[PDB]
Amino acid sequence: LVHGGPCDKTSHPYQAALYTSGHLLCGGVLIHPLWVLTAAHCKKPNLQVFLGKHNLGQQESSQEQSSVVRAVIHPDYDAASHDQDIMLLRLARPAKLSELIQPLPLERDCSAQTTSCHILGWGKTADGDFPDTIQCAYIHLVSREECEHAYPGQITQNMLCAGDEKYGKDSCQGDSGGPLVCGDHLRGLVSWGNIPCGSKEKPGVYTNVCRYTNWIQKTIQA
Ligand SMILES: NCc1ccc(NC(=O)c2c(O)ccc[n+]2Cc2nccn2Cc2ccccc2)cc1
């Protein structure tokens, strides 16, 4: 993501890194000891999930690596429009929770007030390179009306818009599937937006997680 800075070391215990073929693919969010949430467009064979990570190159004492035994994409995911861009990953081994690995509670209230948020990820930074160190940026939710004006005809009830008019802080390539956190609850997942990235042009678009309470619950319990 662009125009942010490195996250406080203890502030992102829910952040996951998704790899395939040995390279970063996407972000993700631990929401249950057995389950990571991410974007549907992040699905590829042979996913490796890393928890407890801060710097990608380092072999950190806190990190946990796991394969995936079930990837559950939402049945109504529409790849062309990114509608319902959400996927649940069942870890081959339950997360060993610690001071640096812990689930993030979901925002269940679709009408939630809070528009002050942050995003996290190892996606492309403003210089065009990919960071070793996890980045964080504060951004703000826009209203549904303004979201709709920014992308006429293309925004569904399953999407949220967020951005930053001061610097253009925005998610970028490599950040997909990572958390939009508002009021310290999981509010969204990085899904799509402007390319090149930068939210002064238009806001980033996020999967609206509150819409999926029932589906997440049903899936985790099957
Ligand atoms: N906020 C702007 C933004 C720009 C890029 C991205 N993510 C990506 O480009 C991305 C990624 O991080 C990991 C794997 C694949 N992608 C690209 C992608 N493929 C399908 C959907 N997407 C995200 C996307 C982002 C912008 C326009 C169209 C699609 C997310 C947000």
The sign one gets for the Cα dihedral 48, 53, 54, 56 is negative
Q: Which domains can be identified in the chain, with CATH numbers?
A: 1-12+104-210 (2.40.10.10), 13-103+211-222 (2.40.10.10)
Separation in Å, CA 156 to CA 15, 56, 170, 176, 195: 26, 34, 20, 18, 20
Residue in 68, 61, 63, 60 with CA at minimum distance from that of residue 25: 68
Task: State the Cα–Cα distance between residues 115 and 220, nearest whole angstrom.
Answer: 28
Burial grade of 158 (CB within 10 A; 0-12, 13-18, 19 or more): buried
Token representation of residue 153? 């005809």
Active site residue 176: yes
Indicate the Cα dihedral angle 166, 123, 96, 35, nearest 10°.
Answer: 90
Task: State the Cα–Cα distance between residues 7 and 96, nearest whole angstrom.
Answer: 22
Resolution (Å units): 1.7
Place of tokens 């974007």: 39
Place of tokens 């991410």: 38
This structure was determined by: X-ray
Task: State the Cα–Cα distance between residues 195 and 207, nearest whole angstrom.
Answer: 18
Task: State the Cα–Cα distance between residues 101 and 52, nearest whole angstrom.
Answer: 5
Ligand 1, atom 21, residue with closest C-alpha? 41
Place of tokens 């890194």: 17
Helix, strand, or coil here: 38? strand
Half-sphere exposure (CA, 13 Å, Cβ side) for 36? 37
Residues with C-beta less than 6 Å from any ligand 1 atom: 26, 41, 123, 170-176, 190, 192-195, 197, 204
| 172 in Cβ contact with 124 (< 8 Å) | yes
Token representation of residue 28? 């993700």
Ligand 1, atom 9, residue with closest C-alpha? 173
Centroid of ligand 1 to alpha carbon of 222 (angstroms): 30
